[PDB]
Design goal:
about 210 residues, mainly beta, Thaumatin, eight-stranded mixed sheet, five-stranded mixed sheet, 4 helices, about 35% strand, globular, plant protein, Multicrystal, Room-Temperature
């Protein structure tokens, strides 16, 4: 499937794409404001994620650091990034269907729209000013709004026993972004699309 990743923000982001144990395509690239990067993702890819990283410095060998979403210091991500990160998540060609969602379970750094570019489903978006409204205990110095599991490391926020309810913190993400997952057991906001759809992820879609 092809994904077009578009940076509509007024600042540079470093896009990242990984399935957690491997890069998707080149795995990461710098995107200046307006730039589009088209990647190819193998059919049957399960558990892929796309995110933006902010305020990165890399050297000639593609090693360095980002203030949000850093994936072990690499330009080309092999692993998932460090919260806070707004996430586009996808499982492709799973018994004839593609499944897509946006998640705030690992926090929020950059607003995002995640839409099919082919026919037969609708897109999802979380474009509210979560960083501006972020509760004081969740604000990350780096920039961004952390999830409560990251900050506090409790069974309730991390849903580690597999039983957890919504919280004051999860309700904050859900109030501003009803179409994104706000905690591990949130009522799913997954969208089912036809198998082998194509997609665009746009950072700062309302810019």
């Amino acid at each position: 499937a092809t994904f077009e990743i578009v940076n509509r923000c007024s600042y540079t982001v470093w896009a990242a794409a990984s399935k957690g144990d491997a890069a998707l395509d080149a795995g990461g690239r710098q995107l200046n404001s307006g730039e589009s990067w088209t990647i190819n993702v193998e059919p049957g890819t399960n558990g892929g994620k796309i995110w933006a990283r902010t305020d990165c410095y890399f050297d000639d060998s593609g090693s360095g650091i980002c203030k949000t979403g850093d994936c072990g210091g690499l330009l080309r991500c092999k692993r998932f990034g460090r919260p806070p990160t707004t996430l586009a998540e996808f499982s492709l060609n799973q018994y004839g269907k593609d499944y897509i969602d946006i998640s705030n379970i690992k926090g929020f750094n950059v607003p995002m729209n995640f839409s099919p570019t082919t026919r037969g489903c609708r897109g999802v978006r979380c474009a509210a000013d979560i960083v501006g409204q972020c509760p004081a205990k969740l604000k990350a110095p780096g920039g961004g709004c952390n999830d409560a599991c990251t900050v506090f490391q409790t069974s309730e926020y991390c849903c580690t026993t597999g039983k957890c309810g919504p919280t004051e913190y999860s309700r904050f993400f859900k109030r501003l972004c009803p179409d994104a997952f706000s905690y591990v057991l949130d009522k799913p906001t997954t969208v089912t699309c036809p198998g082998s759809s194509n997609y665009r992820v746009t950072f700062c879609p309302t810019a």
